[PDB]
Amino acid sequence: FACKTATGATIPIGGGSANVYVNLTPAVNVGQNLVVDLSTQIFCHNDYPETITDYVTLQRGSAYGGVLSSFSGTVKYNGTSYPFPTTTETARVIYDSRTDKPWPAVLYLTPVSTAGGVAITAGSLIAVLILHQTNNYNSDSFQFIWNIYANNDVVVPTGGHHH
Ligand SMILES: OC[C@H]1O[C@H](O)[C@@H](O)[C@@H](O)[C@@H]1O
């Protein structure tokens, strides 16, 4: 079992870490959800599907930068919504093919009530997600650590008399 990003960063058998750079909607209005769909950027495969079934969860997710300071939200993993930051492991997804399959993780993040102005800066680390892989074959338990960086600034528009 190993994983890669659409841009070509890889994490090999046994786990490791990689960086994922994401485009974000540049203005996230109050009450709205900024959606970070990692299933278009992170893909994984099973190296021995004839004999081994791989089980993959989101084990932990932490918030950073502007997301930590100015957003609240959830992570939708394989269709079920969990808190984000996430300290409790999710249900599992089965990987059973040598063909790359998306990792079905999507962040839904809404600005907190005191947000306003620049909330996320380009290049900043905004999230870390731990993909946990086990299987039905041996004792392997591996962590694939995805560092999620913003490709662009995100602003929460404000009102007032200054524009
Ligand atoms: O993907 C099938 C199998 O491949 C390798 O042996 C290791 O990555 C295992 O942990 C995994 O279960």
Side-chain angles (χ1 to χ4, degrees), residues 1-3 5-28 31 33-49 51-75 77-152 154-163:
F1 179 91
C3 302
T5 69
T7 298
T10 56
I11 308 185
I13 286 167
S17 71
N19 300 329
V20 187
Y21 304 82
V22 298
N23 305 316
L24 306 162
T25 70
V28 176
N33 301 301
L34 170 54
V35 180
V36 184
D37 178 4
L38 294 175
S39 77
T40 62
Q41 296 191 241
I42 298 171
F43 301 85
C44 302
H45 67 278
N46 179 328
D47 284 308
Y48 196 9
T51 294
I52 304 185
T53 304
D54 286 323
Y55 303 126
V56 173
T57 62
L58 168 72
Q59 179 162 26
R60 249 193 91 161
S62 296
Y64 299 91
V67 166
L68 176 62
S69 62
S70 321
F71 290 75
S72 84
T74 61
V75 55
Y77 188 66
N78 198 36
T80 293
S81 178
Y82 302 87
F84 177 76
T86 321
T87 52
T88 301
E89 182 165 38
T90 68
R92 87 216 174 151
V93 174
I94 289 166
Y95 286 74
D96 59 3
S97 167
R98 258 172 205 98
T99 296
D100 274 337
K101 169 174 145 73
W103 190 47
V106 180
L107 301 184
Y108 292 79
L109 308 165
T110 183
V112 302
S113 64
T114 44
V118 169
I120 292 167
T121 60
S124 55
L125 179 69
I126 57 176
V128 174
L129 303 165
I130 304 180
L131 182 163
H132 181 205
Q133 173 253 323
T134 57
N135 61 38
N136 69 350
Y137 177 85
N138 64 15
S139 55
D140 284 356
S141 171
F142 296 132
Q143 281 75 30
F144 291 74
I145 298 171
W146 304 103
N147 301 302
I148 315 301
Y149 292 88
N151 278 321
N152 54 275
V154 178
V155 172
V156 172
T158 65
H161 294 93
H162 176 76
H163 318 108

Short mmCIF file of all heavy atoms in Angstrom, two decimals, residues 1-2 13-14 45-49 52-54 133-135 137-138 140 142, ligand 1:
data_model
loop_
_atom_site.label_atom_id
_atom_site.label_comp_id
_atom_site.label_asym_id
_atom_site.label_seq_id
_atom_site.Cartn_x
_atom_site.Cartn_y
_atom_site.Cartn_z
N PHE A 1 0.87 -1.22 0.00
CA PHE A 1 0.00 0.00 0.00
C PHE A 1 0.86 1.21 0.00
O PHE A 1 1.78 1.35 0.82
CB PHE A 1 -0.90 0.00 1.22
CG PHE A 1 -1.76 1.19 1.29
CD1 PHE A 1 -3.01 1.18 0.73
CD2 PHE A 1 -1.32 2.34 1.92
CE1 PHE A 1 -3.81 2.31 0.78
CE2 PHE A 1 -2.10 3.46 1.99
CZ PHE A 1 -3.36 3.46 1.45
N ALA A 2 0.58 2.11 -0.93
CA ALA A 2 1.30 3.37 -0.96
C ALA A 2 0.41 4.41 -1.57
O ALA A 2 -0.67 4.09 -2.10
CB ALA A 2 2.60 3.26 -1.75
N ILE A 13 5.44 2.37 0.80
CA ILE A 13 5.12 1.30 1.72
C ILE A 13 5.72 1.62 3.08
O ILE A 13 6.89 1.98 3.18
CB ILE A 13 5.66 -0.03 1.19
CG1 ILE A 13 4.78 -0.49 0.05
CG2 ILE A 13 5.69 -1.05 2.28
CD1 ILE A 13 5.35 -1.63 -0.81
N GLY A 14 4.90 1.55 4.13
CA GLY A 14 5.37 1.80 5.46
C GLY A 14 5.06 3.18 5.97
O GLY A 14 5.28 3.46 7.15
N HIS A 45 -3.09 3.00 -3.48
CA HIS A 45 -3.31 1.71 -4.11
C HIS A 45 -2.80 0.61 -3.20
O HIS A 45 -1.97 0.82 -2.31
CB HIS A 45 -2.58 1.61 -5.46
CG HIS A 45 -1.09 1.61 -5.36
ND1 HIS A 45 -0.35 2.77 -5.23
CD2 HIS A 45 -0.20 0.60 -5.36
CE1 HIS A 45 0.93 2.47 -5.17
NE2 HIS A 45 1.06 1.15 -5.25
N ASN A 46 -3.35 -0.59 -3.46
CA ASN A 46 -3.01 -1.81 -2.76
C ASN A 46 -2.02 -2.57 -3.63
O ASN A 46 -2.25 -2.72 -4.84
CB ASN A 46 -4.31 -2.61 -2.62
CG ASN A 46 -4.15 -3.95 -1.94
OD1 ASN A 46 -3.12 -4.61 -2.03
ND2 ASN A 46 -5.22 -4.38 -1.32
N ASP A 47 -0.93 -3.03 -3.04
CA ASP A 47 0.15 -3.65 -3.79
C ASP A 47 -0.03 -5.14 -4.00
O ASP A 47 0.72 -5.72 -4.78
CB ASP A 47 1.48 -3.40 -3.07
CG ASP A 47 1.97 -2.01 -3.26
OD1 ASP A 47 2.03 -1.59 -4.43
OD2 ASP A 47 2.28 -1.32 -2.25
N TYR A 48 -1.00 -5.75 -3.36
CA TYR A 48 -1.14 -7.21 -3.44
C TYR A 48 -2.61 -7.56 -3.27
O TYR A 48 -2.98 -8.31 -2.36
CB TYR A 48 -0.30 -7.84 -2.35
CG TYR A 48 -0.02 -9.31 -2.49
CD1 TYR A 48 -0.35 -10.02 -3.62
CD2 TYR A 48 0.58 -9.99 -1.45
CE1 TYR A 48 -0.09 -11.39 -3.73
CE2 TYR A 48 0.87 -11.35 -1.56
CZ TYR A 48 0.52 -12.02 -2.69
OH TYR A 48 0.77 -13.38 -2.79
N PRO A 49 -3.48 -6.99 -4.09
CA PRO A 49 -4.92 -7.13 -3.82
C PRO A 49 -5.44 -8.54 -3.92
O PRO A 49 -6.48 -8.83 -3.31
CB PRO A 49 -5.55 -6.22 -4.87
CG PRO A 49 -4.52 -6.18 -5.99
CD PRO A 49 -3.19 -6.18 -5.29
N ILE A 52 -4.32 -9.56 -0.19
CA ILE A 52 -4.41 -8.65 0.94
C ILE A 52 -5.50 -7.63 0.66
O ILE A 52 -5.58 -7.12 -0.45
CB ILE A 52 -3.06 -7.93 1.17
CG1 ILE A 52 -1.96 -8.96 1.35
CG2 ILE A 52 -3.18 -6.96 2.37
CD1 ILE A 52 -0.63 -8.37 1.70
N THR A 53 -6.31 -7.33 1.66
CA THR A 53 -7.24 -6.21 1.61
C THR A 53 -6.70 -5.14 2.55
O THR A 53 -6.33 -5.45 3.69
CB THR A 53 -8.63 -6.65 2.06
OG1 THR A 53 -9.07 -7.74 1.25
CG2 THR A 53 -9.60 -5.48 1.92
N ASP A 54 -6.59 -3.92 2.05
CA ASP A 54 -6.09 -2.80 2.83
C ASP A 54 -7.25 -1.98 3.37
O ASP A 54 -8.27 -1.78 2.70
CB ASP A 54 -5.19 -1.89 1.97
CG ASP A 54 -3.85 -2.51 1.68
OD1 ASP A 54 -3.30 -3.20 2.58
OD2 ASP A 54 -3.35 -2.34 0.55
N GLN A 133 -3.25 3.14 7.55
CA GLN A 133 -3.47 1.93 6.77
C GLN A 133 -3.13 0.70 7.59
O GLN A 133 -2.06 0.62 8.21
CB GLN A 133 -2.65 2.00 5.50
CG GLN A 133 -2.68 0.72 4.70
CD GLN A 133 -1.38 -0.06 4.76
OE1 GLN A 133 -0.30 0.52 4.79
NE2 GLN A 133 -1.49 -1.38 4.75
N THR A 134 -4.05 -0.25 7.60
CA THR A 134 -3.84 -1.59 8.12
C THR A 134 -4.33 -2.55 7.05
O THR A 134 -4.60 -2.15 5.91
CB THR A 134 -4.65 -1.79 9.38
OG1 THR A 134 -6.03 -1.54 9.09
CG2 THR A 134 -4.20 -0.87 10.51
N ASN A 135 -4.42 -3.84 7.36
CA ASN A 135 -4.81 -4.81 6.36
C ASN A 135 -5.34 -6.03 7.09
O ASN A 135 -5.42 -6.05 8.32
CB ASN A 135 -3.63 -5.14 5.45
CG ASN A 135 -2.48 -5.75 6.20
OD1 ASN A 135 -2.69 -6.54 7.12
ND2 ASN A 135 -1.26 -5.41 5.82
N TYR A 137 -3.88 -9.06 6.69
CA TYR A 137 -2.81 -9.99 6.34
C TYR A 137 -1.72 -10.08 7.39
O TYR A 137 -1.22 -11.18 7.66
CB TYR A 137 -2.21 -9.52 5.00
CG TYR A 137 -1.03 -10.32 4.52
CD1 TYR A 137 -1.21 -11.48 3.80
CD2 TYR A 137 0.27 -9.89 4.75
CE1 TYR A 137 -0.12 -12.22 3.34
CE2 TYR A 137 1.36 -10.61 4.30
CZ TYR A 137 1.15 -11.78 3.59
OH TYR A 137 2.23 -12.51 3.12
N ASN A 138 -1.33 -8.97 7.99
CA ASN A 138 -0.26 -8.99 8.99
C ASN A 138 -0.55 -7.87 9.99
O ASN A 138 -1.66 -7.36 10.06
CB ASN A 138 1.12 -8.92 8.32
CG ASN A 138 1.32 -7.66 7.58
OD1 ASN A 138 0.55 -6.71 7.79
ND2 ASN A 138 2.31 -7.62 6.69
N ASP A 140 0.70 -4.90 10.10
CA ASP A 140 1.13 -3.59 9.63
C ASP A 140 0.14 -2.51 10.04
O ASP A 140 -1.08 -2.65 9.91
CB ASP A 140 1.19 -3.59 8.11
CG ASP A 140 2.41 -4.31 7.56
OD1 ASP A 140 3.29 -4.78 8.32
OD2 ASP A 140 2.48 -4.42 6.30
N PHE A 142 0.35 1.66 9.48
CA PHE A 142 1.23 2.68 8.95
C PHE A 142 0.48 4.00 8.83
O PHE A 142 -0.73 4.03 8.61
CB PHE A 142 1.77 2.25 7.60
CG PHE A 142 2.65 1.03 7.65
CD1 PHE A 142 2.45 -0.01 6.76
CD2 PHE A 142 3.70 0.93 8.55
CE1 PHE A 142 3.27 -1.12 6.76
CE2 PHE A 142 4.52 -0.17 8.57
CZ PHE A 142 4.31 -1.19 7.66
O1 LIG B 1 -1.08 -3.22 -0.15
C1 LIG B 1 -0.89 -4.56 0.26
C2 LIG B 1 0.23 -4.62 1.24
O2 LIG B 1 1.44 -4.13 0.59
C3 LIG B 1 2.60 -4.20 1.39
O3 LIG B 1 2.94 -5.53 1.80
C4 LIG B 1 2.45 -3.38 2.67
O4 LIG B 1 2.25 -2.00 2.31
C5 LIG B 1 1.21 -3.83 3.40
O5 LIG B 1 1.00 -3.03 4.56
C6 LIG B 1 -0.02 -3.79 2.51
O6 LIG B 1 -1.11 -4.30 3.22
#
